[PDB]
Amino acid sequence: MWRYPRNADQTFWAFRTCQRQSEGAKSLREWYRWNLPNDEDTHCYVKCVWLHLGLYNEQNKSLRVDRIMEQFNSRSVAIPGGINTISGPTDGTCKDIYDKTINFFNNNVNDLRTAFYGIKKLSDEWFTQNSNTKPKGTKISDFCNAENREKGGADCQHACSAYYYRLVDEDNEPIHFRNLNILGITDEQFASCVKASNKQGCKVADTMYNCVEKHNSQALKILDNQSPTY
Ligand SMILES: COCCOCCOCCOc1ccc(C(C)(C)CC(C)(C)C)cc1
């Protein structure tokens, strides 16, 4: 189950993972400077980030306005105006989710960057003060191989890596929406790993890790290779 508020590693992962999933986009460079142009790839990049932050409810096709507000409150940032526009059901398209949130973004850019650690100084401070989280610049394998993290406090073998690959969340619950298609894992294959993982504790993480590796032996190696900055 997802935890809120989202921390600086969790927000960083959502941005970078969604950037990788749209890496051929014409507007990629604009996203780097916090500009979200009105084009299809940007629409779907925006939907991806809302989803990967844990802020899109796929069941009612609505933003988790309650958790968005919690992020502001937890970060001591004033609640922005215009919340009504981002609230309520969408039709599920990238276009609709973009249209419902673009003014909210454009009208509150720097407060949103503050609340979601989108400022280098604020992110650097979070990581400095949370040394038990994988630092930027360090690979998942190198971090999780240290301090017996892969054991998960028990007898596991991939407890830490499965978390940082986002196969499972902090609760060792599988992350159902994870997209590893470009790594050679189809949606059906990933779903089968989720289903294979009534297991309990970090055994869910190990089951997800082993199942993914079984489908494609390189996929998790690629995520590890990408992991210094995701
Ligand atoms: C290599 O370094 C790349 C760093 O880029 C990280 C910043 O990502 C770019 C910003 O992109 C977005 C994506 C989504 C959003 C939304 C609209 C979803 C708002 C948000 C993040 C405040 C919830 C805003 C900016």
Side-chain angles (χ1 to χ4, degrees), residues 12 15-16 19 30-36 45-47 49-50 53 55 101-102 104-105 112-113 116 118 229:
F12 191 51
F15 290 123
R16 297 280 302 131
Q19 284 166 21
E30 295 305 326
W31 310 342
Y32 278 30
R33 55 185 172 196
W34 293 83
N35 177 33
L36 301 175
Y45 169 63
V46 162
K47 181 181 177 187
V49 172
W50 283 120
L53 285 171
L55 298 176
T101 58
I102 186 50
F104 174 76
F105 173 74
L112 281 165
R113 294 184 61 182
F116 288 91
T229 63

Short mmCIF file of all heavy atoms in Angstrom, two decimals, residues 12 15-16 19 30-36 45-47 49-50 53 55 101-102 104-105 112-113 116 118 229, ligand 1:
data_model
loop_
_atom_site.label_atom_id
_atom_site.label_comp_id
_atom_site.label_asym_id
_atom_site.label_seq_id
_atom_site.Cartn_x
_atom_site.Cartn_y
_atom_site.Cartn_z
N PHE A 12 11.53 11.64 -7.31
CA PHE A 12 12.57 11.51 -8.32
C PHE A 12 12.34 10.29 -9.21
O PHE A 12 12.44 10.37 -10.44
CB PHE A 12 13.94 11.43 -7.64
CG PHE A 12 15.11 11.56 -8.57
CD1 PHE A 12 15.19 12.61 -9.47
CD2 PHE A 12 16.15 10.64 -8.54
CE1 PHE A 12 16.28 12.74 -10.32
CE2 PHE A 12 17.23 10.76 -9.39
CZ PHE A 12 17.30 11.81 -10.28
N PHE A 15 9.42 10.90 -11.74
CA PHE A 15 9.83 11.76 -12.86
C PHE A 15 10.73 11.00 -13.83
O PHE A 15 10.49 10.99 -15.04
CB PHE A 15 10.58 12.99 -12.34
CG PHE A 15 9.73 13.99 -11.61
CD1 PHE A 15 10.04 14.35 -10.31
CD2 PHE A 15 8.64 14.59 -12.23
CE1 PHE A 15 9.28 15.28 -9.62
CE2 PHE A 15 7.86 15.52 -11.54
CZ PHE A 15 8.18 15.86 -10.23
N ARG A 16 11.80 10.38 -13.32
CA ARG A 16 12.78 9.76 -14.19
C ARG A 16 12.20 8.55 -14.92
O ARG A 16 12.46 8.37 -16.12
CB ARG A 16 14.01 9.36 -13.37
CG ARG A 16 14.72 10.56 -12.75
CD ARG A 16 15.62 11.25 -13.79
NE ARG A 16 16.62 10.33 -14.34
CZ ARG A 16 16.85 10.20 -15.65
NH1 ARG A 16 16.16 10.92 -16.52
NH2 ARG A 16 17.76 9.33 -16.08
N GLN A 19 10.08 9.85 -17.67
CA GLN A 19 10.92 10.40 -18.73
C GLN A 19 11.51 9.29 -19.60
O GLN A 19 11.57 9.42 -20.83
CB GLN A 19 12.04 11.26 -18.13
CG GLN A 19 11.56 12.61 -17.65
CD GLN A 19 12.59 13.30 -16.78
OE1 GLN A 19 13.78 12.98 -16.82
NE2 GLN A 19 12.12 14.25 -15.97
N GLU A 30 12.06 20.40 -22.74
CA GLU A 30 11.20 21.34 -22.03
C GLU A 30 10.82 20.81 -20.65
O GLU A 30 10.79 21.56 -19.67
CB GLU A 30 9.96 21.65 -22.86
CG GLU A 30 10.27 22.38 -24.17
CD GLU A 30 11.07 23.67 -23.95
OE1 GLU A 30 10.87 24.34 -22.92
OE2 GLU A 30 11.90 24.02 -24.81
N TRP A 31 10.53 19.51 -20.55
CA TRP A 31 10.21 18.93 -19.25
C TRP A 31 11.35 19.14 -18.26
O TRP A 31 11.11 19.42 -17.08
CB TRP A 31 9.92 17.44 -19.39
CG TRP A 31 8.91 17.07 -20.45
CD1 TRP A 31 7.99 17.90 -21.05
CD2 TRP A 31 8.73 15.78 -21.02
NE1 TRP A 31 7.24 17.18 -21.98
CE2 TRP A 31 7.68 15.88 -21.97
CE3 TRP A 31 9.33 14.53 -20.81
CZ2 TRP A 31 7.25 14.78 -22.72
CZ3 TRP A 31 8.90 13.44 -21.57
CH2 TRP A 31 7.87 13.58 -22.50
N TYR A 32 12.60 19.01 -18.72
CA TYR A 32 13.75 19.23 -17.84
C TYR A 32 13.75 20.62 -17.22
O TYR A 32 14.26 20.79 -16.11
CB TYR A 32 15.06 19.06 -18.62
CG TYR A 32 15.56 17.64 -18.79
CD1 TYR A 32 14.69 16.57 -18.87
CD2 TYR A 32 16.92 17.37 -18.89
CE1 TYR A 32 15.16 15.26 -19.05
CE2 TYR A 32 17.40 16.09 -19.06
CZ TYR A 32 16.52 15.04 -19.15
OH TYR A 32 17.01 13.75 -19.33
N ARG A 33 13.25 21.63 -17.92
CA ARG A 33 13.15 22.96 -17.33
C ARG A 33 11.73 23.29 -16.89
O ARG A 33 11.35 24.47 -16.86
CB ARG A 33 13.71 24.04 -18.28
CG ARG A 33 13.13 24.11 -19.69
CD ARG A 33 13.91 25.16 -20.48
NE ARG A 33 13.58 25.20 -21.90
CZ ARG A 33 14.32 25.79 -22.83
NH1 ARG A 33 15.45 26.41 -22.49
NH2 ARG A 33 13.95 25.77 -24.10
N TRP A 34 10.95 22.27 -16.51
CA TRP A 34 9.64 22.44 -15.88
C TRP A 34 8.67 23.19 -16.78
O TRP A 34 7.93 24.08 -16.34
CB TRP A 34 9.77 23.12 -14.51
CG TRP A 34 10.48 22.20 -13.55
CD1 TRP A 34 11.82 22.03 -13.42
CD2 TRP A 34 9.87 21.28 -12.64
NE1 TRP A 34 12.10 21.08 -12.47
CE2 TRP A 34 10.91 20.60 -11.98
CE3 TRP A 34 8.55 20.97 -12.31
CZ2 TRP A 34 10.67 19.63 -11.00
CZ3 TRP A 34 8.31 20.00 -11.35
CH2 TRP A 34 9.36 19.35 -10.71
N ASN A 35 8.66 22.83 -18.06
CA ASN A 35 7.73 23.37 -19.04
C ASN A 35 7.03 22.19 -19.70
O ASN A 35 7.69 21.24 -20.14
CB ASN A 35 8.47 24.22 -20.09
CG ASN A 35 7.56 24.73 -21.18
OD1 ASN A 35 6.39 25.01 -20.94
ND2 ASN A 35 8.10 24.87 -22.39
N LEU A 36 5.69 22.22 -19.74
CA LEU A 36 4.88 21.08 -20.18
C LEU A 36 4.05 21.49 -21.39
O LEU A 36 2.88 21.87 -21.24
CB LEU A 36 3.98 20.56 -19.06
CG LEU A 36 4.69 20.10 -17.78
CD1 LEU A 36 3.67 19.71 -16.69
CD2 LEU A 36 5.63 18.94 -18.07
N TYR A 45 3.11 11.85 -20.61
CA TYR A 45 4.13 12.00 -19.58
C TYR A 45 3.53 12.52 -18.28
O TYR A 45 3.86 12.03 -17.18
CB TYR A 45 5.23 12.93 -20.10
CG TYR A 45 6.23 13.37 -19.04
CD1 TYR A 45 7.05 12.45 -18.40
CD2 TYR A 45 6.35 14.71 -18.69
CE1 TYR A 45 7.97 12.85 -17.43
CE2 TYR A 45 7.27 15.12 -17.71
CZ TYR A 45 8.07 14.20 -17.09
OH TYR A 45 8.98 14.60 -16.13
N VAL A 46 2.63 13.50 -18.39
CA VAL A 46 1.97 14.06 -17.22
C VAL A 46 1.11 13.01 -16.53
O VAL A 46 1.17 12.85 -15.30
CB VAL A 46 1.14 15.29 -17.61
CG1 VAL A 46 0.12 15.61 -16.52
CG2 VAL A 46 2.07 16.50 -17.85
N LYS A 47 0.30 12.26 -17.30
CA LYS A 47 -0.49 11.19 -16.71
C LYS A 47 0.40 10.16 -16.02
O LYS A 47 0.10 9.71 -14.90
CB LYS A 47 -1.35 10.49 -17.77
CG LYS A 47 -2.21 9.37 -17.19
CD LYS A 47 -3.04 8.66 -18.27
CE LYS A 47 -3.83 7.51 -17.66
NZ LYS A 47 -4.54 6.67 -18.67
N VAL A 49 3.31 10.60 -14.63
CA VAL A 49 3.90 11.08 -13.38
C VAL A 49 2.85 11.09 -12.27
O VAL A 49 3.12 10.64 -11.15
CB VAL A 49 4.54 12.47 -13.57
CG1 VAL A 49 4.98 13.04 -12.21
CG2 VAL A 49 5.77 12.40 -14.50
N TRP A 50 1.64 11.59 -12.56
CA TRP A 50 0.58 11.52 -11.56
C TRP A 50 0.40 10.08 -11.07
O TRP A 50 0.29 9.83 -9.87
CB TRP A 50 -0.75 12.03 -12.11
CG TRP A 50 -0.92 13.51 -12.22
CD1 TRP A 50 -1.15 14.21 -13.38
CD2 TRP A 50 -0.95 14.48 -11.16
NE1 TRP A 50 -1.31 15.54 -13.10
CE2 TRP A 50 -1.20 15.74 -11.75
CE3 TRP A 50 -0.79 14.40 -9.77
CZ2 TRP A 50 -1.27 16.92 -11.00
CZ3 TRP A 50 -0.87 15.57 -9.02
CH2 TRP A 50 -1.11 16.81 -9.64
N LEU A 53 3.52 8.80 -9.03
CA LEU A 53 3.59 9.42 -7.72
C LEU A 53 2.64 8.79 -6.71
O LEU A 53 2.74 9.08 -5.52
CB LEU A 53 3.26 10.91 -7.83
CG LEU A 53 4.40 11.75 -8.44
CD1 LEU A 53 3.92 13.17 -8.72
CD2 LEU A 53 5.59 11.76 -7.51
N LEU A 55 -0.69 9.29 -7.10
CA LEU A 55 -1.70 10.33 -6.96
C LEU A 55 -2.82 10.21 -7.98
O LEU A 55 -3.62 11.14 -8.12
CB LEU A 55 -1.04 11.71 -7.07
CG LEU A 55 -0.02 11.95 -5.95
CD1 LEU A 55 0.67 13.29 -6.17
CD2 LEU A 55 -0.70 11.88 -4.57
N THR A 101 -5.11 19.40 -15.22
CA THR A 101 -4.03 19.78 -14.31
C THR A 101 -3.04 20.81 -14.86
O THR A 101 -2.20 21.30 -14.08
CB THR A 101 -3.26 18.53 -13.86
OG1 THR A 101 -2.75 17.84 -15.00
CG2 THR A 101 -4.19 17.61 -13.15
N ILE A 102 -3.11 21.19 -16.14
CA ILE A 102 -2.05 22.04 -16.68
C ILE A 102 -2.09 23.44 -16.06
O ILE A 102 -1.04 24.00 -15.70
CB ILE A 102 -2.12 22.09 -18.22
CG1 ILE A 102 -0.93 22.84 -18.81
CG2 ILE A 102 -3.46 22.64 -18.70
CD1 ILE A 102 0.46 22.37 -18.27
N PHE A 104 -3.30 24.20 -13.10
CA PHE A 104 -2.82 23.98 -11.73
C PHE A 104 -1.29 23.96 -11.68
O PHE A 104 -0.68 24.56 -10.79
CB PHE A 104 -3.42 22.68 -11.19
CG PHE A 104 -2.91 22.26 -9.84
CD1 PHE A 104 -3.34 22.89 -8.69
CD2 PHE A 104 -2.02 21.20 -9.72
CE1 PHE A 104 -2.89 22.48 -7.44
CE2 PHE A 104 -1.57 20.79 -8.46
CZ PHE A 104 -2.00 21.43 -7.34
N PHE A 105 -0.66 23.29 -12.65
CA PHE A 105 0.80 23.29 -12.70
C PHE A 105 1.34 24.68 -13.02
O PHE A 105 2.14 25.24 -12.26
CB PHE A 105 1.30 22.28 -13.74
CG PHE A 105 2.78 22.37 -13.95
CD1 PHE A 105 3.65 21.87 -12.99
CD2 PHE A 105 3.30 23.00 -15.07
CE1 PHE A 105 5.02 21.95 -13.16
CE2 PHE A 105 4.68 23.09 -15.24
CZ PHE A 105 5.54 22.58 -14.29
N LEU A 112 4.81 23.88 -6.35
CA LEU A 112 4.77 22.46 -6.65
C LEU A 112 6.17 21.85 -6.64
O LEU A 112 6.37 20.74 -6.13
CB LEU A 112 4.08 22.22 -7.99
CG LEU A 112 2.55 22.30 -7.92
CD1 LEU A 112 1.99 22.42 -9.33
CD2 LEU A 112 1.99 21.06 -7.24
N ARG A 113 7.15 22.57 -7.20
CA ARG A 113 8.52 22.09 -7.12
C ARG A 113 8.98 21.96 -5.67
O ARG A 113 9.66 20.99 -5.31
CB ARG A 113 9.45 23.00 -7.93
CG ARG A 113 9.16 22.97 -9.44
CD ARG A 113 10.16 23.82 -10.23
NE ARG A 113 11.53 23.34 -10.07
CZ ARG A 113 12.60 23.92 -10.61
NH1 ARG A 113 12.44 25.00 -11.35
NH2 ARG A 113 13.81 23.42 -10.40
N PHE A 116 7.19 18.81 -4.05
CA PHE A 116 7.57 17.52 -4.61
C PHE A 116 9.07 17.41 -4.85
O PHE A 116 9.50 16.63 -5.71
CB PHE A 116 6.79 17.28 -5.91
CG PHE A 116 5.34 16.97 -5.68
CD1 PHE A 116 4.39 17.98 -5.66
CD2 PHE A 116 4.93 15.66 -5.43
CE1 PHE A 116 3.06 17.69 -5.43
CE2 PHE A 116 3.59 15.37 -5.20
CZ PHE A 116 2.66 16.38 -5.21
N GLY A 118 11.25 19.17 -6.29
CA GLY A 118 11.68 19.49 -7.63
C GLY A 118 12.71 20.60 -7.70
O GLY A 118 12.90 21.21 -8.76
N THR A 229 20.84 7.43 -11.31
CA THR A 229 19.87 8.53 -11.32
C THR A 229 18.50 8.08 -11.81
O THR A 229 17.68 8.92 -12.20
CB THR A 229 20.37 9.69 -12.19
OG1 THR A 229 20.46 9.24 -13.54
CG2 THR A 229 21.71 10.18 -11.71
C1 LIG B 1 18.19 14.19 -15.57
O1 LIG B 1 17.43 15.10 -14.78
C2 LIG B 1 16.03 15.11 -15.11
C3 LIG B 1 15.27 15.77 -13.96
O2 LIG B 1 13.93 16.13 -14.30
C4 LIG B 1 13.11 16.00 -13.14
C5 LIG B 1 11.91 16.93 -13.22
O3 LIG B 1 10.92 16.39 -14.09
C6 LIG B 1 10.48 17.37 -15.00
C7 LIG B 1 9.14 17.94 -14.57
O4 LIG B 1 8.08 17.18 -15.16
C8 LIG B 1 6.82 17.24 -14.60
C9 LIG B 1 5.97 16.13 -14.69
C10 LIG B 1 4.71 16.18 -14.12
C11 LIG B 1 4.28 17.34 -13.46
C12 LIG B 1 2.91 17.36 -12.86
C13 LIG B 1 2.03 18.16 -13.83
C14 LIG B 1 2.33 15.95 -12.82
C15 LIG B 1 2.92 18.11 -11.50
C16 LIG B 1 3.52 17.50 -10.22
C17 LIG B 1 4.85 16.78 -10.40
C18 LIG B 1 3.75 18.64 -9.24
C19 LIG B 1 2.58 16.53 -9.51
C20 LIG B 1 5.13 18.44 -13.38
C21 LIG B 1 6.40 18.39 -13.95
#
